[PDB]
Write a protein that holds these residues in place. Structure first.
Motif, PDB file in Angstrom:
ATOM      1  N   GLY A  72       0.776  -1.224   0.000  1.00  0.00           N
ATOM      2  CA  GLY A  72       0.000   0.000   0.000  1.00  0.00           C
ATOM      3  C   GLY A  72       0.812   1.280   0.000  1.00  0.00           C
ATOM      4  N   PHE A  73       2.129   1.200   0.157  1.00  0.00           N
ATOM      5  CA  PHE A  73       2.982   2.325  -0.208  1.00  0.00           C
ATOM      6  C   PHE A  73       3.064   2.435  -1.720  1.00  0.00           C
ATOM      7  CE2 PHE A  73       4.428   1.619   4.102  1.00  0.00           C
ATOM      8  CZ  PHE A  73       4.530   2.928   4.567  1.00  0.00           C
ATOM      9  N   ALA A  74       3.282   3.657  -2.203  1.00  0.00           N
ATOM     10  CA  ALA A  74       3.299   3.893  -3.631  1.00  0.00           C
ATOM     11  C   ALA A  74       4.223   5.065  -3.907  1.00  0.00           C
ATOM     12  CB  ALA A  74       1.895   4.194  -4.184  1.00  0.00           C
ATOM     13  N   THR A  75       4.795   5.076  -5.098  1.00  0.00           N
ATOM     14  CA  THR A  75       5.530   6.241  -5.560  1.00  0.00           C
ATOM     15  C   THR A  75       4.828   6.802  -6.788  1.00  0.00           C
ATOM     16  OG1 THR A  75       7.085   4.733  -6.689  1.00  0.00           O
ATOM     17  CG2 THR A  75       7.740   5.652  -4.544  1.00  0.00           C
ATOM     18  N   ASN A  76       4.729   8.124  -6.838  1.00  0.00           N
ATOM     19  CA  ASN A  76       4.079   8.821  -7.934  1.00  0.00           C
ATOM     20  C   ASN A  76       5.137   9.611  -8.687  1.00  0.00           C
ATOM     21  OD1 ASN A  76       0.956   9.382  -8.618  1.00  0.00           O
ATOM     22  ND2 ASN A  76       2.195  11.174  -9.197  1.00  0.00           N
ATOM     23  N   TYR A  77       4.996   9.665 -10.017  1.00  0.00           N
ATOM     24  CA  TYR A  77       5.970  10.274 -10.919  1.00  0.00           C
ATOM     25  C   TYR A  77       5.222  11.263 -11.800  1.00  0.00           C
ATOM     26  CZ  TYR A  77       8.398   6.030  -9.434  1.00  0.00           C
ATOM     27  OH  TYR A  77       8.958   5.016  -8.672  1.00  0.00           O
ATOM     28  N   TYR A  78       5.517  12.556 -11.654  1.00  0.00           N
ATOM     29  CA  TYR A  78       4.814  13.604 -12.379  1.00  0.00           C
ATOM     30  C   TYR A  78       5.808  14.406 -13.226  1.00  0.00           C
ATOM     31  CZ  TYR A  78       1.531  17.362 -13.479  1.00  0.00           C
ATOM     32  OH  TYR A  78       0.732  18.281 -14.152  1.00  0.00           O
ATOM     33  N   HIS A  79       5.270  15.089 -14.251  1.00  0.00           N
ATOM     34  CA  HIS A  79       6.042  15.750 -15.321  1.00  0.00           C
ATOM     35  C   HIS A  79       6.641  14.740 -16.305  1.00  0.00           C
ATOM     36  CE1 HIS A  79       5.550  19.344 -12.957  1.00  0.00           C
ATOM     37  NE2 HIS A  79       6.470  19.020 -12.065  1.00  0.00           N
ATOM     38  N   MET A  80       5.900  13.676 -16.621  1.00  0.00           N
ATOM     39  CA  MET A  80       6.417  12.567 -17.412  1.00  0.00           C
ATOM     40  C   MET A  80       6.016  12.682 -18.881  1.00  0.00           C
ATOM     41  SD  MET A  80       8.076  10.739 -15.264  1.00  0.00           S
ATOM     42  CE  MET A  80       8.355   9.197 -16.129  1.00  0.00           C
ATOM     43  N   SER A  81       6.690  11.881 -19.709  1.00  0.00           N
ATOM     44  CA  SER A  81       6.317  11.693 -21.107  1.00  0.00           C
ATOM     45  C   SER A  81       6.664  10.265 -21.514  1.00  0.00           C
ATOM     46  CB  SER A  81       7.021  12.706 -22.015  1.00  0.00           C
ATOM     47  OG  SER A  81       8.398  12.390 -22.152  1.00  0.00           O
TER      48      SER A  81
END
Ligand SMILES: [Zn+2]
Length: 173
Positions: A72-81
């Protein structure tokens, strides 16, 4: 297994990190870090970003993807392509998720602000952002600063083997 995170690049290489900040850059908790490998400004040859751990993919948009671990831990990655996975896909630690965007409009496809190409990296639990303080990545302990993006190396740093790496300095995996 027990949730463990790695820096989202290859062993023995270095990128750069800014100070810890909330997902928006205002208020609490300091859940996020901005990583970049120094490739340059908009239009430059931006790198691919590796999954910090294994889990199930959620793809929110063309510039926003998440890996949720069995814990239930997660990593989010933003500004992607160039995202490589869709909702429900499974990835392993190290899997190439996409690039961080080398174009301004793609980097901000869901809003926000940016001074240059980077990935906005966020730790979550139960789908909610959580503080990075005293969490570990590639065996570094993360010590958050006293304000959003604080880069004072007495307040914010990564610590491994009793040695500190500050913001905006080579951070070796
Ligand atoms: Zn950020």
């Amino acid at each position: 297994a027990t949730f463990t995170m790695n820096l989202p690049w290859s062993q023995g290489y270095y990128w750069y990190s800014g100070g810890a900040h909330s997902n928006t850059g205002s208020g609490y908790p300091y859940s996020s870090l901005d990583f970049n490998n120094g490739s340059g400004g908009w239009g430059s040859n931006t790198p691919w970003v590796q999954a910090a751990h294994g889990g199930v993919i959620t793809r929110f948009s063309s510039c926003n993807i998440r890996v949720t671990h069995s814990s239930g831990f997660a990593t989010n990655y933003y500004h992607m392509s160039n995202l490589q996975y869709n909702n429900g896909d499974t990835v392993q630690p190290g899997t190439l998720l996409g690039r961080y965007a080398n174009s301004y409009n793609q980097a901000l496809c869901e809003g926000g602000q940016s001074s240059g190409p980077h990935v906005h990296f966020t730790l979550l639990q139960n789908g909610q952002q959580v503080s990075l303080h005293n969490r570990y990545i590639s065996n570094y302990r993360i010590d958050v600063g006293n304000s959003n993006y604080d880069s004072n190396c007495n307040n914010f740093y990564f610590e491994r083997n009793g040695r500190r790496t500050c913001a905006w300095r080579p951070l070796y995996r």
